[PDB]
């Protein structure tokens, strides 16, 4: 785009030419180091120094330790490292990431900068490689809040295996919002990356600041990129945490809180053996379920985790699988427990694909604790221009169609509508029976196609006649 | 991601549908095979082609009625996965009927 | 029918899975005998029909295809296969159903059956309900008043079957009848080399990255996905008039013909069509215009009759997905007679295939319109 | 190979024994036209 | 076995057909692309599915005329490989014409 | 050639070399050097030769 395209090209130059999972770590370290280089400069110049020195304060060091918590030195940054091009040797960054990550006092979010590993074959191959890589990194066009914006595509460089497409982020943001300007936001089990966590409050920071962003995820490098994701995008410091571990086996905080909004995105085949092998039969959140979740359908364990941590003022916004009729005897009654009260507010389907090789659409379940109580299944399949989302990725106003459907129970022909509570007690509580409104219904007329066919047969008779005449040349 | 990886998920969902529904019929549990094996196929592109590049499965059908006669190549591959898994779960159901229903007597 | 009541489907219906199959033999050539009936086009090649645990397909059950579809319906005609996903529908009661009747009624509800989008199994849903039944006239004259209407439906299904049979025999006899006439011509007709009848043009293909060259336009584009027809007047693709700046194409006149040279031949018969608009075609086929000594219909029907030998002439060109060379396609001689033996015999063979060929001036205008109004007569007859 | 490929599975058809067969098909088809046209009015 | 592995063989055979035949025409060298790119596709099953599971290539055609409308799924995959390689060799030939024919002047 | 394989003994009367990605027939030009007058070679190849 405007500067998406130029920095896009200069950054996609760096991707060559081997498996990018390993040297993407060096790319992350270089861009993270440059963001530190300019963030700490933006603090200390708020016009003195173009370049710095090695000061020995230990008090002026410890003032941003409680305030920004990136305390290495003054002159160990990327604007100051560019004097040392191909600096022998490569792993001085392994020293240059250690003393900023001392971080015992206070409030670390450290034990974190182990991205830049050591491979490599020898030390000089690493030296020439990171010299060329830092040459390409500093060679990026700087310009100033958009500096992590190309880093957006750096989190989606693999997805053109599981992060988010941005229209879904804006959808779940506009479904968790709004009208609940109260403590707090936000909580996230199966956080993945902080992409879907971003555009809710990054657009709506001026709405209200309330509290921190609460994440938890499994994979270690995904844990690292997630905990740098909201770091690089000019978000604050204090309670913006992602913990490590399975959210099912290790949820915390238990006490904090019945929240006001949560977002998530679960992957398929995140299984766990029921029902149960662990002590989650006797937990604090699956006693509402009664029967518990089976192995290969571990998605609804997240939504039974969801009603634990949510207040009746607040609402939910999560996503699920369309691959459902009843999901065994141990989940038909779980869908019965979901529809047993007005737990579910709305459900919204999408259109295939507009993803990265799925190729099917998704379910989107929006929940609260609020009595109306009609299970309004406001699905959509067209449109939903599901070919490409590049129609104004900043402000599409495509959710304005959905928010307009969200306004007051829109009974729109060839679109979903407000369906009753006991319209779905007749079905086996599926999604969607209603509505799927009846396109391409075509029928005919008695006599129009037959006097035509009579004229066609009279053409065929004279065809037979000059067939019989022209048997002799 | 081999054929055995998908076969393990279909195996465990078959054990779910036999176990927690407590069905003691061959035909209804083969309808449960139609439930479970269709729900155990992968959905990513590369996760399908990794099973297709693995052993066990071949390219060609036996019933061409599983093929939509169109550009839907991934539907054809998914139907081949479904067919191989339904054959292996014919054998697996004929095992697990007399393996499991003798076990649940208590 | 005096009394009409709606009844559930599964009340008078026995549904069953197919029996156990192991029918993966490695060769199932046409020398065998069983009809292997599948979904879509309901015929794959034969197999030996006895002692395999074969279901043997007795006097009138019906089937359903398939998982994800539940819409394709075929009469089990005489005695056929059980082809490994044929889920069987029959009836316990025999004195009411006569389940070719419920075959004739099951295809009357396109409401849910025209929506195949998600991955589900729908067995219980059509297993429930509904059906219109002449109950409570049972068993006195329930099927007796159905006899007239099943006579209507059976004669009309017979109309469709005989039209397909006479279209088959018409195209068979016409394909060979093109070539006692007009062939082995003597004596002696000039064996004029192709390419000496006119400067025919190669083709050309633009790259499809530029949206300005691709999004709009009115010049017709010819690709072999749109081919396989006869007498193409337009196609799916219209290309931009600006895009001929770098299309590497040539604008051909409005009485032209076109011929594929890639991946249609080396397996089956190459198609051809009278292209009537000034259009452009890709790298993967060729445009033929003849020059003034002729009628273009004569060259068209000459190639359309001699296709089975001009595919033989340069058949292999390696084991490629690429195909017949340009030189041996260029270097074939066709008999080109005097002017009196062009227009008369090409009006003969042109009137004959403008009897046959789709669509306008053809038999499908009869056939699909009969199908449409047959379905509408079914829907008009089946109300209360 | 091009040479030799000796002339297997090569087939042709018959000139005019199948035209009176299709003519008998059309004589069945005339009363098929009539059985559609009369039964088109209930 | 990535897409780039097959693209390197097609690249080198293109350099052969431009180099050792010494052709200075766009159209004849695109016929040489029709020669070389069709001869650089793999032939093993897993070596095709590894390229299909790799990046660059997608499933869907642009011309469905490359598809034999039948059970020949591997022909469809091979035609998609051929189509992606012919597009990349459109770009590569428009590079290597003015890259190579300026170089051979001696 | 970059190497000396132009002037080797097994390529004395034949003709110009075999290119890189079509290295099948280098084995068969290697073959009929290592054969007597009496016996015979039995080698296997790709089918897709038009002239390659």
From Swiss-Prot, chains B, E:
Listed Pfam families: ocr
List the InterPro entries hit by this protein, alphabetically: B-form_Ocr (IPR036207), Ocr (IPR014798)
Biological process GO annotation list?
A: symbiont-mediated evasion of host restriction-modification system; symbiont-mediated suppression of host innate immune response
Keywords of the record: Early protein, Host-virus interaction, Inhibition of host innate immune response by virus, Restriction-modification system evasion by virus, Viral immunoevasion
Q: What does this protein do?
A: Prevents both degradation and modification of T7 DNA by the host restriction-modification complex. Structural mimic of the phosphate backbone of B-form DNA that binds to and completely occupies the DNA-binding sites of all known families of the complex type I DNA restriction enzymes. Thereby, inhibits the restriction endonuclease activity and protects the phage genome as it penetrates into host cytoplasm. Inhibits host transcription by binding to the bacterial RNAP and competing with sigma factors. Inhibits the host exclusion defense system BREX.
* Subunit text: Homodimer. Interacts with HsdM (AC P08957), the M subunit of host type I methyltransferase restriction enzyme M.EcoKI; 1 Ocr dimer binds to M.EcoKI. Interacts with HsdR (AC P08956), the R subunit of host type I bifunctional endonuclease and methyltransferase restriction enzyme R.EcoKI; 2 Ocr dimers binds to R.EcoKI. Interacts with host PglX/BrxX (AC P0DUF9); this interaction inhibits the enzymatic activity of PglX/BrxX through high-affinity binding. Forms a 2:2 tetrameric complex with phage T7 OCR.
Return the protein name.
Answer: Protein Ocr
UniProtKB/Swiss-Prot annotation, chain C:
Q: Which UniProt keywords apply?
A: DNA-binding, Plasmid, Restriction system
Any single GO molecular-function term of the entry would be:
DNA binding
Q: Which InterPro entries match?
A: Restrct_endonuc_typeI_TRD, Restrct_endonuc_typeI_TRD_sf, Type-I_RE_S_subunit
Q: Thylakoid among the record's keywords? A: no
Chain segments carrying region Target-recognition domain 1: 1-141
Q: Which Gene3D superfamilies match?
A: DNA methylase specificity domains (3.90.220.20)
Q: Which domain of life is it from?
A: Bacteria
Which residue intervals make up region (Conserved region 1)?
142-187
Cite the residue spans of the region called Target-recognition domain 2. Answer: 188-337
A Gene Ontology BP annotation from the UniProt entry = DNA restriction-modification system
UniProt keyword Zinc, yes or no:
no
- For region Conserved region 2, the annotated ranges are 338-384
Summarizing the function annotation, the protein's role is: The specificity (S) subunit of a type I restriction enzyme; this subunit dictates DNA sequence specificity. The presence or absence of a 4-residue repeat changes the sequence specificity; a third copy of TAEL inserted at position 179-180 changes the recognition site from 5'-GAAN(6)RTCG-3' (for EcoR124I) to 5'-GAAN(7)RTCG-3' (for EcoR124II).
- Domain comment as written in the entry: Contains two DNA recognition domains (TRD), each specifying recognition of one of the two defined components of the target sequence.
Q: How does it assemble?
A: The type I restriction/modification system is composed of three polypeptides R, M and S; the restriction enzyme has stoichiometry R(2)M(2)S(1) while the methyltransferase is M(2)S(1). There is an equilibrium between R(2)M(2)S(1) and R(1)M(2)S(1); the latter is methylation and translocation proficient but restriction deficient.
State the similarity comment: Belongs to the type-I restriction system S methylase family.
Something else known: Type I restriction and modification enzymes are complex, multifunctional systems which require ATP, S-adenosyl methionine and Mg(2+) as cofactors and, in addition to their endonucleolytic and methylase activities, are potent DNA-dependent ATPases.
Q: What is this protein called?
A: Type I restriction enzyme EcoR124I/EcoR124II specificity subunit
User: What is the originating organism of this protein?
Assistant: Escherichia coli
What taxonomic ancestry is recorded?
Answer: Bacteria, Pseudomonadati, Pseudomonadota, Gammaproteobacteria, Enterobacterales
From Swiss-Prot, chain D:
Per its UniProt entry, which superkingdom is the organism in? Answer: Bacteria
Instruction: Please state what the protein is called.
Output: Type I restriction enzyme EcoR124I/EcoR124II methylase subunit
Q: Where is this region: C-terminal tail?
A: 13-42
> What family is this?
Belongs to the N(4)/N(6)-methyltransferase family.
**Native species:** Escherichia coli
Function of the protein: The subtype gamma methyltransferase (M) subunit of a type I restriction enzyme. In the presence of the R subunit the complex can also act as an endonuclease, binding to the same target sequence but cutting the DNA some distance from this site. Whether the DNA is cut or modified depends on the methylation state of the target sequence. When the target site is unmodified, the DNA is cut.
What other note does the entry give for this protein?
Answer: Type I restriction and modification enzymes are complex, multifunctional systems which require ATP, S-adenosyl methionine and Mg(2+) as cofactors and, in addition to their endonucleolytic and methylase activities, are potent DNA-dependent ATPases.
Q: What is the primary gene name for this protein?
A: hsdM
What does the UniProt entry state concerning the protein's domains?
Answer: The C-terminus is required for assembly of the restriction enzyme complex. The individual domains assume different positions in the enzyme, allowing the holoenzyme to regulate the methylase, endonuclease and translocation states.
Assembly behavior: The type I restriction/modification system is composed of three polypeptides R, M and S; the restriction enzyme has stoichiometry R(2)M(2)S(1) while the methyltransferase is M(2)S(1). There is an equilibrium between R(2)M(2)S(1) and R(1)M(2)S(1); the latter is methylation and translocation proficient but restriction deficient.
């Amino acid at each position: 785009a405007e500067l998406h395209r130029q920095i896009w090209q200069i950054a996609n130059d760096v991707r060559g030419s081997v498996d990018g999972w390993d040297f993407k770590q060096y790319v992350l370290g270089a861009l993270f180091y440059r963001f530190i280089s300019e963030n700490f400069s933006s603090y200390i110049e708020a016009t003195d120094d173009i370049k710095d020195d090695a000061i020995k304060t230990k008090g002026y060091f410890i003032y941003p330790s409680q305030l920004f918590c990136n305390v290495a030195a003054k002159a160990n940054t990327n604007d100051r490292l560019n004097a040392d091009l191909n600096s022998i040797f490569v792993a001085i960054e392994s020293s240059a990431y250690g003393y900023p990550s001392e971080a015992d006092i206070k409030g670390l979010f450290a034990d974190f900068d182990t991205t830049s590993n050591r491979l490599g074959n020898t030390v000089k191959d690493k030296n020439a490689r990171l010299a060329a890589v830092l040459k390409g990194v500093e060679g990026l066009k700087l310009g100033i809040d958009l500096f992590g914006d190309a880093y957006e595509f750096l989190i989606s460089n693999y997805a053109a295996e599981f992060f988010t497409p941005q229209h879904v982020s804006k959808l779940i943001a506009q479904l968790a919002m709004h009208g609940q300007t109260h403590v707090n936001k936000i909580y996230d089990p199966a956080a993945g990356s902080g992409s879907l966590l971003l555009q809710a409050k990054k657009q709506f920071d001026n709405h209200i600041i309330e509290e921190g962003f609460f994440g938890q995820e499994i994979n270690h490098t995904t844990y690292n990129l997630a905990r740098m994701n909201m770091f690089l995008h000019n978000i604050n410091y204090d309670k913006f945490d992602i913990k490590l571990g399975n959210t099912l086996t290790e949820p915390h905080f238990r006490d904090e809180k019945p929240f006001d909004a949560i977002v998530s995105n679960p992957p398929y085949s995140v299984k766990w053996i029921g029902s149960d092998d662990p002590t989650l039969i006797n937990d604090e959140r699956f006693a509402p379920a009664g029967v518990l979740a089976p192995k290969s359908k571990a998605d609804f364990a997240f939504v039974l985790h969801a009603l634990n941590y949510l207040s009746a003022k607040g609402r939910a916004a999560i996503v699920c699988f369309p691959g459902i009729f009843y999901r065994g005897g141990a989940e038909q009654k779980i869908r019965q427990y979901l529809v047993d009260n007005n737990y579910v507010e709305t459900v919204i389907s999408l259109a295939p694909n507009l993803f990265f090789g799925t190729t099917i659409a998704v379910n989107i379940l929006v929940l609260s604790k609020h009595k109306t109580d009609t299970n309004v299944q406001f699905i959509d399949a067209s449109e939903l221009f599901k070919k490409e989302t590049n129609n104004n990725i900043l402000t599409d106003a495509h959710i304005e169609q959905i928010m307009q459907v969200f306004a007051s129970k829109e009974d729109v022909a060839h679109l979903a509508k407000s369906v009753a509570f006991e319209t779905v007690v007749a079905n086996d509580y599926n999604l969607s029976v209603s509505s799927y409104v009846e396109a391409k219904d075509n029928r005919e007329i008695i006599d129009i196609a037959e006097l035509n066919a009579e004229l066609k047969t009279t053409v065929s008779k004279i065809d037979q006649l000059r067939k019989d005449i022209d048997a002799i040349v | 991601m081999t054929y055995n990886n998908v076969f393990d998920h279909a195996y465990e969902m078959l054990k779910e549908n036999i176990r927690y529904d407590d069905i003691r019929d061959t035909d209804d549990l083969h309808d449960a095979i139609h439930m479970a094996a269709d729900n155990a196929v992968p959905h990513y592109y590369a996760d399908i082609f990794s099973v297709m590049a693995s052993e066990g499965i071949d390219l060609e059908f036996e019933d061409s009625g599983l093929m939509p006669d169109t550009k839907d190549v991934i539907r054809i591959l998914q139907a081949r996965i479904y067919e191989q898994l339904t054959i292996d779960l014919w054998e697996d159901a004929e095992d697990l009927l007399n393996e499991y229903l003798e076990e649940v007597e208590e | 029918g005096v009394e009409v009541e709606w009844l559930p489907l599964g009340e008078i219906t026995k549904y069953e899975q197919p029996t156990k199959y192991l029918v993966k033999a490695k060769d199932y050539h046409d020398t065998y005998t069983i009809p292997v009936l599948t979904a879509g086009k309901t015929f794959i090649l034969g197999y030996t029909n006895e002692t395999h645990g074969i279901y043997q397909a007795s006097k009138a059950p019906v089937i359903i295809f398939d998982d994800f579809t539940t819409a394709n319906k075929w009469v089990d005609f005489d005695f056929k296969a059980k082809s490994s996903a044929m889920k069987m529908v029959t009836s316990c009661d025999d004195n009411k159903t006569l389940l070719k009747y419920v075959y004739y009624w099951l295809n009357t509800l396109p409401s849910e059956f025209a929506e195949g989008d998600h991955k589900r199994q729908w067995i219980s849903n059509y297993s429930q309900k509904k059906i219109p039944i002449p109950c409570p006239d049972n068993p006195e004259k329930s099927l007796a008043i159905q006899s007239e209407i099943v006579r209507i439906l059976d004669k009309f299904t017979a109309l469709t079957a005989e039209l397909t049979a006479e279209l088959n025999m018409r195209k068979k006899q016409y394909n060979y009848y093109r070539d006692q006439l007009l062939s082995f011509k003597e004596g002696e007709v000039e064996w004029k080399t192709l390419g000496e009848i006119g400067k025919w043009y190669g083709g050309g293909t633009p790259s499809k990255n530029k949206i300005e060259f691709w999004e709009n336009g009115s010049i017709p584009w010819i690709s072999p996905k749109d081919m396989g027809r006869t007498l193409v007047d337009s196609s799916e693709d219209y290309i931009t008039e600006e895009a001929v700046l770098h299309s590497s194409t040539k604008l051909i006149p409005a009485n032209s013909i076109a011929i594929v040279v890639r991946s249609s031949i080396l397996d089956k018969v190459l198609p051809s069509a009278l292209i009537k608009v000034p259009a452009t075609l890709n790298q993967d086929m060729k445009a033929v215009i003849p020059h003034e000594n002729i009628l273009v219909k004569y060259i068209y029907h000459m190639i359309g009759s001699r296709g089975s030998d001009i595919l033989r002439a340069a058949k292999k060109t390696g084991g490629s997905v690429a195909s017949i060379d340009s030189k041996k396609l260029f270097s074939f001689k066709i008999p080109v007679p005097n002017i009196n033996e062009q227009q008369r015999i090409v009006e003969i063979l042109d009137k004959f295939d403008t009897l046959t060929n789709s669509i306008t001036e053809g038999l499908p205008r009869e056939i699909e319109l009969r199908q449409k109004q047959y379905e509408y007569y079914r829907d008009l007859l089946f109300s209360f």
